Amino acid sequence: VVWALCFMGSLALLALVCTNRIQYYFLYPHVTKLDEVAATRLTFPAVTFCNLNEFRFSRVTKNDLYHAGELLALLNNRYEIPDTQTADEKQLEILQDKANFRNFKPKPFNMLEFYDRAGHDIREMLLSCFFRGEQCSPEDFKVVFTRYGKCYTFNAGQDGKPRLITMKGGTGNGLEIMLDIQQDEYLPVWGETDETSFEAGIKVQIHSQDEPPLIDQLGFGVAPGFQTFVSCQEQRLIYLPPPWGDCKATFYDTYSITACRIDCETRYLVENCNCRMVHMPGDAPYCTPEQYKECADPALDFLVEKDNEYCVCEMPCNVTRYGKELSMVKIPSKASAKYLAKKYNKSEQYIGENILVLDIFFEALNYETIEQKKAYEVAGLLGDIGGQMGLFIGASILTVL
Amino acid sequence: MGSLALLALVCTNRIQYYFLYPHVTKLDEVAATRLTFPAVTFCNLNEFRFSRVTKNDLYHAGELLALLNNRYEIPDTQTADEKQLEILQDKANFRNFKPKPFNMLEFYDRAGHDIREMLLSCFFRGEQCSPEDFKVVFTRYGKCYTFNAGQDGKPRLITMKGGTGNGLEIMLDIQQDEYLPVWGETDETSFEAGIKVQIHSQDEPPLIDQLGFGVAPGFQTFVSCQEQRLIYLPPPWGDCKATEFYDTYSITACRIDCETRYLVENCNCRMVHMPGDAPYCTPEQYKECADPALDFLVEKDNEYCVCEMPCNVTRYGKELSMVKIPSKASAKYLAKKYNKSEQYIGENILVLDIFFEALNYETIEQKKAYEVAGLLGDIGGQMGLFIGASILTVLEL
Amino acid sequence: ALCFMGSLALLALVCTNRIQYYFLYPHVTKLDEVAATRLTFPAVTFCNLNEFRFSRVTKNDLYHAGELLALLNNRYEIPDTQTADEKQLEILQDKANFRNFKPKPFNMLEFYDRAGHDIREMLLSCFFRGEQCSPEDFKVVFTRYGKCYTFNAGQDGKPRLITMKGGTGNGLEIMLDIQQDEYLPVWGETDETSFEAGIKVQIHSQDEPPLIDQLGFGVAPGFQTFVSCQEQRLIYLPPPWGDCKATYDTYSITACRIDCETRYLVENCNCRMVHMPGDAPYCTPEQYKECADPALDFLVEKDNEYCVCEMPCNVTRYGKELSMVKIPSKASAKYLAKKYNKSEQYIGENILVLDIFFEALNYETIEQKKAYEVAGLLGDIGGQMGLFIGASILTV
Numbered sequence A: 001v002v003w004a005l006c007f008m009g010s011l012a013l014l015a016l017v018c019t020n021r022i023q024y025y026f027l028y029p030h031v032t033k034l035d036e037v038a039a040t041r042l043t044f045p046a047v048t049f050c051n052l053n054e055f056r057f058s059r060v061t062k063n064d065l066y067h068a069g070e071l072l073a074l075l076n077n078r079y080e081i082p083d084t085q086t087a088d089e090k091q092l093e094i095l096q097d098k099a100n101f102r103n104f105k106p107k108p109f110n111m112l113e114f115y116d117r118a119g120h121d122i123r124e125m126l127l128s129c130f131f132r133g134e135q136c137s138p139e140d141f142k143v144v145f146t147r148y149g150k151c152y153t154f155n156a157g158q159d160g161k162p163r164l165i166t167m168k169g170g171t172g173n174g175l176e177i178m179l180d181i182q183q184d185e186y187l188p189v190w191g192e193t194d195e196t197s198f199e200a201g202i203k204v205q206i207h208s209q210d211e212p213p214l215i216d217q218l219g220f221g222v223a224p225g226f227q228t229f230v231s232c233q234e235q236r237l238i239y240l241p242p243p244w245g246d247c248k249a250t251f252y253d254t255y256s257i258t259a260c261r262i263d264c265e266t267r268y269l270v271e272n273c274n275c276r277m278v279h280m281p282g283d284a285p286y287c288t289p290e291q292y293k294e295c296a297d298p299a300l301d302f303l304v305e306k307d308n309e310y311c312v313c314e315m316p317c318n319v320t321r322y323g324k325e326l327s328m329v330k331i332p333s334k335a336s337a338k339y340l341a342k343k344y345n346k347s348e349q350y351i352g353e354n355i356l357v358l359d360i361f362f363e364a365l366n367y368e369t370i371e372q373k374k375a376y377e378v379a380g381l382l383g384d385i386g387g388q389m390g391l392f393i394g395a396s397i398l399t400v401l
Numbered sequence B: 001m002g003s004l005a006l007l008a009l010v011c012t013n014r015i016q017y018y019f020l021y022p023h024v025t026k027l028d029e030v031a032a033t034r035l036t037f038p039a040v041t042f043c044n045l046n047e048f049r050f051s052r053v054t055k056n057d058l059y060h061a062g063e064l065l066a067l068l069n070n071r072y073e074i075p076d077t078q079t080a081d082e083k084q085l086e087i088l089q090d091k092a093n094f095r096n097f098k099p100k101p102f103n104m105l106e107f108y109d110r111a112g113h114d115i116r117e118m119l120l121s122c123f124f125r126g127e128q129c130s131p132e133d134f135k136v137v138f139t140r141y142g143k144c145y146t147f148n149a150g151q152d153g154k155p156r157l158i159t160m161k162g163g164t165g166n167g168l169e170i171m172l173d174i175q176q177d178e179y180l181p182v183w184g185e186t187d188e189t190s191f192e193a194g195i196k197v198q199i200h201s202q203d204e205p206p207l208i209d210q211l212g213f214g215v216a217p218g219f220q221t222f223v224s225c226q227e228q229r230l231i232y233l234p235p236p237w238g239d240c241k242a243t244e245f246y247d248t249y250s251i252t253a254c255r256i257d258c259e260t261r262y263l264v265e266n267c268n269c270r271m272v273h274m275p276g277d278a279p280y281c282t283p284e285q286y287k288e289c290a291d292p293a294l295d296f297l298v299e300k301d302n303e304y305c306v307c308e309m310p311c312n313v314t315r316y317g318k319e320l321s322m323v324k325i326p327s328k329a330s331a332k333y334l335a336k337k338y339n340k341s342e343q344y345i346g347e348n349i350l351v352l353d354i355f356f357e358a359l360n361y362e363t364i365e366q367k368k369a370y371e372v373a374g375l376l377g378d379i380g381g382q383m384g385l386f387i388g389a390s391i392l393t394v395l396e397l
Numbered sequence C: 001a002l003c004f005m006g007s008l009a010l011l012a013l014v015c016t017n018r019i020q021y022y023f024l025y026p027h028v029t030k031l032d033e034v035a036a037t038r039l040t041f042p043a044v045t046f047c048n049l050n051e052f053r054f055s056r057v058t059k060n061d062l063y064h065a066g067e068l069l070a071l072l073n074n075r076y077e078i079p080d081t082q083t084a085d086e087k088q089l090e091i092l093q094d095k096a097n098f099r100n101f102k103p104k105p106f107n108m109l110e111f112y113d114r115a116g117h118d119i120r121e122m123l124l125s126c127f128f129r130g131e132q133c134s135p136e137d138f139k140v141v142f143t144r145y146g147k148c149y150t151f152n153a154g155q156d157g158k159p160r161l162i163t164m165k166g167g168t169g170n171g172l173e174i175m176l177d178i179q180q181d182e183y184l185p186v187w188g189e190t191d192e193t194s195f196e197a198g199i200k201v202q203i204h205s206q207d208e209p210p211l212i213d214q215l216g217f218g219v220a221p222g223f224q225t226f227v228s229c230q231e232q233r234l235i236y237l238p239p240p241w242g243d244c245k246a247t248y249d250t251y252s253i254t255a256c257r258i259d260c261e262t263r264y265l266v267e268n269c270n271c272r273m274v275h276m277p278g279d280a281p282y283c284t285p286e287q288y289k290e291c292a293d294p295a296l297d298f299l300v301e302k303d304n305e306y307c308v309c310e311m312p313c314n315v316t317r318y319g320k321e322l323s324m325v326k327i328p329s330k331a332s333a334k335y336l337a338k339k340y341n342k343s344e345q346y347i348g349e350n351i352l353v354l355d356i357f358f359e360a361l362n363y364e365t366i367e368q369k370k371a372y373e374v375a376g377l378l379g380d381i382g383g384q385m386g387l388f389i390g391a392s393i394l395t396v
C-alpha cells in the first residue's frame, strides 16, 4: 500500500503547489531592480536659471509703472508713490519722476512684453561660459518664461542640435558659467509681493529635457560672491502600470509631474480668474496686473501651498531624478579682485556683491537605475506548473513499474 | 541507495537554506500622498543672552563660561570691547554680595534666546504660524525649539506636493548683539554665529549637538528633503531591537538614556537637558566632571554607549542650497520693518525653507527570503517520494 | 519499455530550459543600509586653492615660472596689463630685475614643495574623536593643485582610525588659515591661478588616490562647514555576469585615469607633470604652458577615446551632506584675533572650520550577486534526474 500512498501524495502535491502559484500570480507582484554604475555617453541634462530679481529698474517705463505699479508695491491704489516707501534718495527721486502722471495718456500694456523687455538679459548676465572645454554663448541659452519671469535654459534640446554628452567624472566634463546678477538693476523693494524678494542671487533647476521646469517650487539657490560646485548623479526610475503598479504612461509631449501640475494650474486660473499668468501654456487671455494681484496670484498660491484636492498628479511611469551635492568657495580672492574689476569694468566691491561662478558636473558613478519589474510573469508560472508535472509523471511512472 | 541520496541530497540543500534564515531588501521610491511632515528642532549657537546674565548668574556660572577665573575675578586674558568689559566688571563686583540659589535649568530657561524675539515670520503651507507653534526643548545647546513636535495632540501637518510651497519657511534673527563675550574655549561657548537644525521623526528625540546641520545668517537656505523609511528584521533574520525615559526605540533615545546613566554613575548628577530625576549638575560639576564625561562618550567611547539597530528607522535625505539676504534693494525695507540698521540685518537675519521634492518617499524594508511555506512547496514533491521509500525499505524487511 | 524513453524525454526537457537560464548569467543587486560598528574612517585630502606663496617666490623662480604664472610676458618683463596693488607691484618689479642675473637649475616639484602652503602654518587646530592631531598626522601628496595634504592616509602603518557613533564627536574637526596675504597676484588666466579663495577637499578610501581638481568639493573661508557622510560599498560582478575589472596597488577609476593621463603626456610632451607617477622627466614651465597643460586639459575636458576606464569590481563611495555657519561671531572675533596674532578682519577672511563625520546610518552596501549558480541549477533538475536514476535500474 506504500506505493499507493505515494501515488496519492503525488497528486496532493501537484494540487497544493500549483494552487500556491496562480494565487501568487494574480497578486501581480513586482521586484525593484537597483544598479549604480559609471555610464558612458551620459546625456547632459537641461539647466534652467532665473535671476531672483524680475524687473530691471532701468527698463521700467512710465507706462510700466502706471500699470504694474501697485502690483510691484511701487504705487498705492491711487497711483501715488506710497507713504511707506523705504528707498534711497537717488532712487526715490528717479521714481517720483516716473510716477508723475500729469497729462499722461496710458498705452496698451502686457505682462509678457514687460517681462521680455525688462527682465534680466542673458547677454548682460553671462560673463563667461564653458562646456567640456568648449566656449558657449548667450545664443546657447533658450528663453523660457516662468513665475520668476524671464529665465534661461542651457542645453534645452529644442534646437535640434546634436546632444551634449558627459563621459568622465569631474568639473572638466561639465558646465561652468560666471554670472553677474546685476544688483544695481534690482527693483526697489517697498513691500511684500509675489513678484518681489528680499534675496539676491539666482534660482537653478537641473532637469531632463523633456520635462518643463517648475523653478519657483523645485529649484535650488546659488549665491553671489561664491563659486558653487554641483556634483550630480542621474537616477532613472521606471514604474509599472496597473495591475502591477500605479503609474501613468505618457500642452506637453511627455508625461511628467511638473507638466501635469502646470497644465492643472493653468486650467484652475482660467476657470477662476478668466485669465492665465503669462508663463502658462494655452491661448487664454493674459492676466492684467490688476488680475495678478486680485485673483491670479492668490489662486496659484493656494494651489502650490494649501490645495490637497485639485492639482493632485499621478506617478509617471518614467522619472529622471538628479542627485546633487553642493559646496562652495569664495570669489573673488583679494589677489584676483582687481583683475576681475578691471576686466568687466566694475569696482572691486561690485564684483564681490554680484559675481558668481556655477559648476554643474557629474561624479564617477554617474548613473543609477531603479526599475520595477514584473516578478512572476505568465511564462514563469507555466515553468513552475510545468516542471512540477515532470515530477508527478515520474512519481507515476515508478508507480506504474 | 541510488535515489536514497538524490532525494535526501537535493532535499537537504533547501532545508539548509531555510535554517539560514535569509532575507531580501525591497526598495521603492515614490511620490507619496499625505506625507507626514517631520519635526524641526533648532538652536541658537549662542546659549546665553548677555543682557539676561545677572550678578548671581555670573557668580555661579562665571568660571564655566570663561568669564571669571577660579577666584571670582574677571580674567587677566579677557578679549572684550571696552563697553562690554565695563558692563562685566560692574557685574563681577561681588563686594557685599550674598549669593542666592542657582541652577542651570532656570538659567537656560531665563537667559536662553526667546523664540518670541528670534521668530520674525513663520509660514507653513500658506498658513501663518507663531511662537506658540514651537515647543521648548532643552538640549546640550540649552534652550531650543521644535516646530511640529506633535506633543500638543493637534491634527497632523501633512505635505502633498513637491516644492517650497508645501513646506516650512521661517525668518530668524539670531541676535548677535546678545551673544555672550567669548574669552576662552568651553563646551558652552562657540566661535560661530547662526543656528543648528535637526529634521527628525516626532517619536524620536533630537541629538542636535551631534547630528544637526548648520544654517548661516545672511542667507536664505533651501532644504529639499526626502523621507526614507527603513524596516529591519529581528533575529534570527536580522539584528534589530523592537521598541522607559522614551516611548519608541531609537538610536538617539538609546544614547540619551545611556549618557544620563553614565553621568549619574560617574558625576552623581545629570546635565539639565537629560531625563530622569537625578539632581541637576552645578556649574562646578559641569566643568569638573559632567562635560568631560559626556565629551568622552560622544568622542572617545567605544564600549559604554553602544546602541543596537532599531527595527524601524526614519531618515531624511537633505539637499541644501542658498542665496544672499538681504539684497541691496530690500535692505532698507527690512531694516525699517524690524527697526534695525541695514548692517544688522545682513549679520543677523536668516531665512530657512524646509520642504520635500516630488519623489518624497523611499522605503527600504527587509523581508524574509525563505519562509517555511515556501520551503515545503519546493521539497513537498521529494519529501514524500522518500518517506514512501522509507516505509518501503522497512516493508521489505 | 516505452516509458523509459519518456523519462529521458522529460529529463531532457527539464535540463534544456534550466541550461538556458544559466546562460543568460543573470544577477541580482542586494541593497542594505545599516549602522555599522567599527567603521573605518576614510582619508581626507585637501589643497589650498592658491598654489604658490607669494613670499616664497624667488628671483630664480620668477625667471623660470614667470610666464607660466602670468607674472611675466614672453620677454621676461612684467606685463603691460598687470593689475596689482602698488606695494606688490613694487615687490615684483624688484624681483623681475634680471640685470646681471645668472639663472640656476629649476624644477616644478621643488618649486611646489618649497613655495606651496605649509600645513604647519595652515593648521591652527586639529581634533579626531577627542584626540589632538598635528601637522605630522598629515601626509604630503602632490596633485595638480600642487602641494596638498592627506589626513589618515594610512601609509604610516599606524593603527586604523575608526568611527562608531553618529555625529561630529566621532569625526574630524580642523581649523584652517588659508593665508590670503600669501596668495600670488592674479594678472591673467592660467591653469595654475584662480579667482577663488578657500580650499578643495576630497574624501576617499585609503587605497584610492585623490583626483582633487576634478572630484573635490569646496570649503569657503569665514564659515564652519559640516560634512555629514555615509559610506557606500559597491560590489560588481565580472564577465559573464557583469563588466567590472578586478584589481598603483588596487584598481580604481582614478588610479586608471592618472596612469592613463601620465602615459598620454609622456607620449605627446615627452615629460610628465610633477604630480604624476613614473620616472619620466619633469615638464619645464615652458612645457607646462605649451604642451602639458593643454594636453591634460584635453583629456579631462574633451577626450572621449583615450582615457576611458572600465568599472572596478570594488568601489567605495561617500555620500555627503554639507551645511555651514558663520565664523567668527562678533563675540568671538577678538578672542581668535588675539590668539593667532591677527586682525579681526583677517580672521573673517582667512579662518575656516571643517567638520567631517558620519550619520547614524553610516554604512550602505550595494552588491551584485549571481542569481543562478551551478549548485542551484542541479536543484531544479536533480529531482527530474533522480526519477531517471530509478528508471535506469529497471531497464538494465
Ligand SMILES: *[C@@H]1O[C@H](CO)[C@@H](O[C@@H]2O[C@H](CO)[C@@H](O)[C@H](O)[C@H]2NC(C)=O)[C@H](O)[C@H]1NC(C)=O
Pocket: B036, B201, B202, B203, B231, B311, B312, B313, B314
Ligand atoms: C515605523 O515606525 C513609525 C513611527 O515612527 C510607524 O508610523 C506610525 O504608524 C502608526 C500606524 O499606522 C500610526 O498610527 C502613527 O501615526 C505613525 N507614526 C507617524 C508616521 O507619525 C510605522 O508604522 C512603523 N512601520 C512599521 C510597520 O514598523
Ligand SMILES: *[C@@H]1O[C@H](CO)[C@@H](O[C@@H]2O[C@H](CO)[C@@H](O)[C@H](O)[C@H]2NC(C)=O)[C@H](O)[C@H]1NC(C)=O
Pocket: B339
Ligand atoms: C527702534 O530702535 C531704537 C534703537 O535703535 C529704539 O530707540 C532707543 O529707544 C530707547 C527706548 O525708548 C531709548 O532709551 C533710546 O534713547 C533710543 N535710542 C535712540 C538712538 O534713539 C526705538 O524705541 C525703536 N522704535 C520702536 C518704535 O520700537
Ligand SMILES: *[C@@H]1O[C@H](CO)[C@@H](O[C@@H]2O[C@H](CO)[C@@H](O)[C@H](O)[C@H]2NC(C)=O)[C@H](O)[C@H]1NC(C)=O
Pocket: C040, C205, C206, C207, C235, C313, C314, C315, C316
Ligand atoms: C572591497 O575593497 C576594499 C578595499 O578598498 C576591501 O576592504 C579591505 O578588506 C580587507 C579584508 O578584510 C582588509 O584587510 C582591508 O583592511 C580592507 N580595506 C579597508 C576597508 O581599509 C573589501 O574587502 C573589498 N570587498 C570585496 C569583498 O571585494
Ligand SMILES: *[C@@H]1O[C@H](CO)[C@@H](O)[C@H](O)[C@H]1NC(C)=O
Pocket: A208, A210, A238, A317, A318, A319, A320
Ligand atoms: C524613460 O524616458 C526617457 C525620456 O525622458 C527615455 O529616454 C527612456 O527610454 C525611457 N525609459 C523607458 C524604457 O521607459
Ligand SMILES: *[C@@H]1O[C@H](CO)[C@@H](O)[C@H](O)[C@H]1NC(C)=O
Pocket: A345
Ligand atoms: C566703464 O564704466 C564706467 C562707469 O563706471 C563708464 O563710464 C565707462 O564708459 C566704462 N568703460 C568702458 C570702456 O566701457
Ligand SMILES: *[C@@H]1O[C@H](CO)[C@@H](O)[C@H](O)[C@H]1NC(C)=O
Pocket: C341
Ligand atoms: C604679531 O604680529 C605682528 C605683526 O602684525 C608681529 O609684529 C609680532 O611680532 C607678532 N607677535 C608675536 C609675539 O608673534
Ligand SMILES: [Cl-]
Pocket: A261, A265, A303, A304, A311, B161
Ligand atoms: Cl500645483
Ligand SMILES: [Cl-]
Pocket: B255, B259, B297, B298, B305, C165
Ligand atoms: Cl553617546
Ligand SMILES: [Cl-]
Pocket: A168, C257, C261, C299, C300, C307
Ligand atoms: Cl582623464
